[PDB]
Design a protein around this ligand. Structure first.
Ligand SMILES: CC[C@@]1(O)C(=O)OCc2c1cc1n(c2=O)Cc2cc3c(CN(C)C)c(O)ccc3nc2-1
Length: 1195
């Protein structure tokens, strides 16, 4: 075994404590870990073994189902597989529940000793030590041996999950093409990504389905023997809490899906902002999108906050549920007239303290997780019952072949086809079009079957689809594609593929790892690899579907004239290519149409504290948190004082020889119950409000930072990187972190409850508390330095599994062509177990930590129990019963406290990323001092003086010293080399980066006005037109300052009015995604309509009409020159004929003004680049251009 696994040989008292895992933490404390530091899985965890074993039952089970004439049952099959195993772990669950319930009874007798106390009876004292001893071992069961057990219940989960990933993939290769036609990859990948993943989460709780109810019965029976019928009072109320928890579960799922619509509506609208940002800014339409995102968020926040109230009240039930069921029990019990006594109260408090989790949380969860598992199985069953291809599947013969992609009602995909070919001969095929162009090959592969006629083949087939496909590994590994390596074969074919030079020049040699999803190769080179793979296999049958042979290249000739015509030509081969002239070398040509063989037409026939501060300060004044800190303690102190008051009552009562004032004691006691639920519920609402209001603020402080971010921000940051923060992180700050934080705080108080009660009742506990503390601090620090990293490795090692299935599910034909399932199965198993190696660490890592938290927690109970008995002269029965009833309660809650601590610390990083967006360097203000006068653009005069511009500070100067005059209403065409200068002068004109030099517009220096004062007052028509998901009215005027008449005129200025007024909303029609119902030219016509609405005296055309039919461009040209006669127009355009009649042209290259004059005068200088560019037209049209330019003198 490559990575020997210590679990093979660790002794019991190693693996009980996971002591064997110690070396991992040592190294993980010294280093960052890597995939070689993780252990290999034990033999039985191998995907192949589990799958082959489970098939060994599911196979039998479908045999039964056919023989019994019923639909089969996968749930029975896994059960029949795991029954003989999984029952054994039930035995520990049984003894575990016993320990949970037995502890109270002996907590009775150890308290009972104090009720009978005399300092001088050693015999009674020794009995108490025996009870205290068994109380320790009972704790030791729950606190130590529980952890090995829980790991094995987790292993039932992981073992079951892995086996399904095997059987699914095994099915996926056997899957019939029809079933693949009835399927999408996303279904199988999701099934593997999620729906099998549920099998861990059922198995942790499946034993609670019986052990929980059996627990509840036992607790009621015991209590009845302690407190009579009165135990029915609490237990019935406890059981009523079970539906009530479900009632909350129902509601927020409703409101969660109700909020889903708005995060989707927000995130789509946000994605338009982030991707569209540049053109958004030029229009000055921030305020439009600012209103949308604000209103959706303010809508979203209202429902998520209204859900947050119910989510808060839910935890308040978990806070009061012990206190309510205690109160009603003893109140009834007292009203049936019993005195209250320390022994009989704390037993019930402890029995309730034990059962409460089982009925209120584990069992409610379990019935849900079982329900999600059983639905997961039934779809997996559905998948495993899809149809399959017939798995059995020197010469090739075909005869009258009549076949379909599916037996739909249309005519067969192949019809009447017959041929035979023998080795040493090449067929070629003019195949179908609009359909399976290589359908003939697909028949030879047996992807299709005859309704009539026959195909017969012998030997082994090589195939390539015209679609390329590349396997996970190196390119050499793809050239091997699992076959043995053979240097001379490999050399000869790889050289005959001319691949070495390209592979050396472009892909670093054959050792190059093929990257994620095949990223590494160019598609042109990727295509050739398929043939290189094919030829390396030296198969009997070589089937070629157009390998971009249609692409003219020396290799696409060389492969044929040397390799395919001479080397490969000995083998059986069939070729489809557009290279019809290659088929002059073909031995035979088949031409096909409508599946018919139409002719044998042979060719000759032709995180630091500051994060917390920032997050909380964003919620409220610190004065509010002071009010909040009061409520926390008030809830917690009300909680403890209730149980202390119950002790105090018992202590007074047992002192009497005479009546108690029932309505004093029960009065105050009832008060603390009402108080503890009321502060508890109030606290639980307040925390959410403070934190959720904090999330709302961070979004709005952050969202404004995004609109006012300069374009430079969106150059450096990918769209996904930004948009993820608006989906994921602010998702968490609404969905889950306020919840997780309140649950952390709630539990932390309760731990502070037990510890502080314990030191109060027994002061000298305060000494050993500090050792336990410092032990915990070093433990947490030592642990999390590793666990943080294992979770990284686990999350990483997941991604090859889905990638491999996706790649393999894309390659199905090819895999079965090489009948290579026997290996590709092994590749999946290699990936699956390597993830399982990480999952095995993830399970056992947490236990090695969790067992110590329960170790030091187990040590605490010892301290209180024997500490109480040591101080027996001083303590008194009520106070001990308080201390011990709390001490037992620590066991469960303390582990949960630190789990949420780790999860909050991890999740809190989402807040750091959000705040890092709250302070991005802004542009200058939109509105600024020295506002331009009320009609400032009144001439369209522009000066550029020594203008210098860059896409980054200190970057390359893409404008150098650019200096120009543009006169009023002048029409300035601009052109240059492709990619030279480009829009940079436009982005300078919008100040999207601040230019050096000066730009003056209508006597105003552009660098001394607000960016909306500028950008509102100049139109642009962009390189790519943009529509926004919204009304046609908003896409034309979000401010609705233009009349519908003007909006109709604009749509009537273009052709499109009578294509929009017939849409049901008319101007108010909101569009499909990206306006798919409109053509690209029509989207530019929308920008022209926008421009026609704006009627600014300045317009910029950015090369737009290259997307558009010239006849629509002709309309654009017409309407520009008609409508913008008074306007000043700048026009970057590639084809000079669009601009040949400009009053002047600027030509830019290398960032310099190569030319600026009347275009004919530029042509009149035969040295000019403009003349040269017109001469580079290479055509007599240069004369028509020249004449048209000269006419500008005279027309
Ligand atoms: C749901 C997770 C889990 O089942 C688990 O994976 O392992 C076992 C375990 C769990 C949860 C909780 N606990 C556990 O031991 C203890 C616990 C206490 C909780 C408390 C405090 N209790 C004293 C009521 C809460 O307020 C809210 C949620 C709580 N959840 C849990």
């Amino acid at each position: 075994e490559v990575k020997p696994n210590p679990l093979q040989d660790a002794n019991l008292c190693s693996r009980v404590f996971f002591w064997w895992l110690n070396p991992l933490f040592k190294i993980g404390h010294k280093r960052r870990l890597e995939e070689d530091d993780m252990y290999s899985v034990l033999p039985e965890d191998r995907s192949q073994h589990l799958g082959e074993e489970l098939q060994g039952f599911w196979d039998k089970e479908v045999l039964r189902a056919e023989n019994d004439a019923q639909k089969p049952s996968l749930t029975r099959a896994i059960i029949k597989c795991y029954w003989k195993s999984y029952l054994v772990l039930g035995i520990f669950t049984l003894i575990e529940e016993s320990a949970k319930v037995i502890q109270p009874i002996f907590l009775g007798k150890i308290i009972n000793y104090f009720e009978n106390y005399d300092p001088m009876d050693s015999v009674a004292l020794n009995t108490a030590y025996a009870y205290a001893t068994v109380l320790t071992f009972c704790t030791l069961i729950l606190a130590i041996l529980h952890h090995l057990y829980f790991y094995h219940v987790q292993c039932a989960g992981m073992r079951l999950r892995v086996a399904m990933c095997h059987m699914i993939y095994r099915k996926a290769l056997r899957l019939s093409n029809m079933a693949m036609g009835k399927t999408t990859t996303g279904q199988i990948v999701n099934l593997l990504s999620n729906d099998v993943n549920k099998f861990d989460q059922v198995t942790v709780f499946l034993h609670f389905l019986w052990a929980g109810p059996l627990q509840a019965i036992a607790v009621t029976a015991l209590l009845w023997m302690e407190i009579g019928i009165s135990c029915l009072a609490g237990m019935a109320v406890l059981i009523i809490l079970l539906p009530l928890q479900s009632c909350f579960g129902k509601l927020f799922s409703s409101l969660r899906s109700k909020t889903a619509t708005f995060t989707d509506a927000r995130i789509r609208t946000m994605n338009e902002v982030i991707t569209g940002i540049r053109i958004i800014k030029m229009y000055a339409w921030e305020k439009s999108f600012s209103n949308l995102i604000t209103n959706l968020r303010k809508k979203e926040i209202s429902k998520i906050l209204r859900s947050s109230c119910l989510r808060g009240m839910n935890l308040a039930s978990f806070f009061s549920a012990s206190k309510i069921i205690v109160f009603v029990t003893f109140t009834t019990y007292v009203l049936l007239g019993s005195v209250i006594t320390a022994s009989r109260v704390f037993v019930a408090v402890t029995l309730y303290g034990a059962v409460r989790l089982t009925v209120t949380l584990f069992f409610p969860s379990a019935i849900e997780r079982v329900s999600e598992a059983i639905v997961s199985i039934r779809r997996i069953q559905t998948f495993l019952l899809l149809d399959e291809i017939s798995q059995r599947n020197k010469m090739v013969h075909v005869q009258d072949f009549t076949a379909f992609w599916d037996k739909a009602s249309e005519t067969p995909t192949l019809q009447g086809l017959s041929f035979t070919v023998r080795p040493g001969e090449l067929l070629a095929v003019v195949g179908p079009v609009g359909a399976g162009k290589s359908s003939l090959l697909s028949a030879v592969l047996g992807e299709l079957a005859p309704s009539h006629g026959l195909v017969s083949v012998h030997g082994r087939i090589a195939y390539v689809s015209q679609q390329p496909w590349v396997f996970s590994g190196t390119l050499r590994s793809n050239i091997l594609f699992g076959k043995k390596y053979e240097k001379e074969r490999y050399e000869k074919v790889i050289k005959a593929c001319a691949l070495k030079k390209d592979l050396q020049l472009l892909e670093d040699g054959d050792l190059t790892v093929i990257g994620d999803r095949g990223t590494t190769l160019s598609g042109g080179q990727k295509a050739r690899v398929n043939l290189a793979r094919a030829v390396y296999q030296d198969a009997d049958i070589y089937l070629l579907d157009d390998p971009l042979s249609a692409v003219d290249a020396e290799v696409s000739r060389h492969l044929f004239e040397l390799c395919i015509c001479q080397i490969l030509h000995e083998k059986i081969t069939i070729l489809v290519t557009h290279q019809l002239q290659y088929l002059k070398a073909a031995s035979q040509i088949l031409i096909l149409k409508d599946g018919k063989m139409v002719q044998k037409g042979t060719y000759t026939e032709f995180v630091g504290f500051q994060a917390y501060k920032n997050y909380f300060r964003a919620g409220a004044h610190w004065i509010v948190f002071i009010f909040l800190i009061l409520l926390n303690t008030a809830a917690q102190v009300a909680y403890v004082l209730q149980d202390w008051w119950l002790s105090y009552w018992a202590n007074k009562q047992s002192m009497l020889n005479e009546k108690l004032d029932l309505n004093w004691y029960l009065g105050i006691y009832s008060g603390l119950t009402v108080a503890t639920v009321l502060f508890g519920i109030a606290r639980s609402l307040l925390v959410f409000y403070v934190l959720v209001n904090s999330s709302q603020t961070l979004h709005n402080k952050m969202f404004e930072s995004i609109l006012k971010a300069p374009v430079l921000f969106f150059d450096r940051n990918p769209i996904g990187r930004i948009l993820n923060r608006f989906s994921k992180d602010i998702g968490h700050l609404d969905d889950l972190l306020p919840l997780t934080f309140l649950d952390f705080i709630q539990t932390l108080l309760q731990v502070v409850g037990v510890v502080s009660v314990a030191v109060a009742v027994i002061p000298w506990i305060a000494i050993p508390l500090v050792p336990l503390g410092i032990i915990f601090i070093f433990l947490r620090r030592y642990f999390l330095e590793t666990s943080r990293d294992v979770k990284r490795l686990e999350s990483t090692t997941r991604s090859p599994v889905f990638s491999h299935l996706s790649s393999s599910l894309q390659g199905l034909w090819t895999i079965r062509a090489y009948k290579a399932e026997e290996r590709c199965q092994e590749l999946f198993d290699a990936h699956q177990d390597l993830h399982s190696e990480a999952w095995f660490l993830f399970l056992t890592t947490s236990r090695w930590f969790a067992v110590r938290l329960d170790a030091i927690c187990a040590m605490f109970v010892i301290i209180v129990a024997f500490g109480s008995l040591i101080l027996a002269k001083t303590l008194d029965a009520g106070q001990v019963g308080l201390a011990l009833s709390y001490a037992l309660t620590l066991m469960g809650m303390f582990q949960w406290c630190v789990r949420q601590s780790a999860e909050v610390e991890n999740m809190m990083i989402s807040v750091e990323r959000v705040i890092e967006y709250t302070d991005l360097e802004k542009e200058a203000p939109w509105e600024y001092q020295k506002r331009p006068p009320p009609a400032w653009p009144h001439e369209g005069v522009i000066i550029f003086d020594n203008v210098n511009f860059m896409y980054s500070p200190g970057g390359p100067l893409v404008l150098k010293h650019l200096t120009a005059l543009i006169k009023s209403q002048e029409k300035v065409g601009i052109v240059g080399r492709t990619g030279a200068g480009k829009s940079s002068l436009i982005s300078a004109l919008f100040r999207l980066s601040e230019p050096e030099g000066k730009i003056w517009i209508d006597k105003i220096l552009t660098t001394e006005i607000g960016l909306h004062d500028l950008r509102k007052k100049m139109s642009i028509i962009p390189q790519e037109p943009v529509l926004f998901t919204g009304t046609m009215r908003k896409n034309l005027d979000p401010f609705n300052e233009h009349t519908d008449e003007e909006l109709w005129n604009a749509l009537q200025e273009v052709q499109l009015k009578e294509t929009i007024e017939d849409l049901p909303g008319k101007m108010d029609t909101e569009l499909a995604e990206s306006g798919s119902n409109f053509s690209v030219g029509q989207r530019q016509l929308v920008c022209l309509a926008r421009a026609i609405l704006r009627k600014n005296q300045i317009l910029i055309i950015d090369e737009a009409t290259a997307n558009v039919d010239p006849r629509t461009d002709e309309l654009i040209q017409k309407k520009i020159r008609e409508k913008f006669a008074h306007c000043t127009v700048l026009t970057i355009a590639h084809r000079l004929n669009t601009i040949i009649d400009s009053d002047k042209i600027m030509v830019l290259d290398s960032g310099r003004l190569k030319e600026y004059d009347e275009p004919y005068v530029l042509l009149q200088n035969k040295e000019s680049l403009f003349y040269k560019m017109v001469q580079q037209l290479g055509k007599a049209e240069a004369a028509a251009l020249t004449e048209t330019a000269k006419q500008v003198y005279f027309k």
